[PDB]
Design a protein around this ligand. Structure first.
Ligand code: NA
Length: 35
């Protein structure tokens, strides 16, 4: 997805998401039905 769609889904930038721990990245992907 686009940078704008990413920010809408996750409410943060891709760089912000990458600073999260893996467990939380994975948690968010599942919560949102993505990836
Ligand atoms: Na929106």
């Amino acid at each position: 997805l686009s940078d704008e769609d990413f920010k809408a889904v996750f409410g943060m930038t891709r760089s912000a998401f990458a600073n999260l721990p893996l467990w939380l990245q994975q948690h968010l992907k599942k919560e949102k039905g993505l990836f």
